[PDB]
Design a binder for these strands. Structure first.
Ligand SMILES: [Zn+2]
Ligand SMILES: [Zn+2]
Length: 67
DNA sequence: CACAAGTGAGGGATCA
DNA sequence: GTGATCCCTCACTTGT
């Protein structure tokens, strides 16, 4: 099973389908300090661990890897 | 501005 | 549709 966007093959349609969901680029998780939007909750909780290290943290919006 | 190295966000996996 | 986790990537970032 492959995708018409990347051509990346997937051994199961269950995880190919969650890959096509990554194409719409839904960023529903936002940091309540620097306003940066995230695709996963785990990406947000890992991000605050660095907000405790440094005081002045503000990254630029990074690009998603697949369109 | 190339270049290396350190950085952290994106995205793949199994599973409840 | 979640999401949690383990982890490897790779674009930014920094320094030379
Ligand atoms: Zn795809
Ligand atoms: Zn933040």
């Amino acid at each position: 099973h492959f995708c018409q966007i990347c051509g990346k093959t997937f051994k199961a349609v269950e995880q190919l389908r969650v890959h096509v969901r990554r194409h719409k680029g839904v960023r529903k998780f936002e940091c309540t300090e620097c306003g940066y939007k995230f695709t996963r909750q785990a990406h947000l909780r890992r991000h605050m661990e660095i907000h405790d290290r440094v005081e002045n943290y503000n990254p630029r919006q990074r690009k998603l890897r697949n369109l």
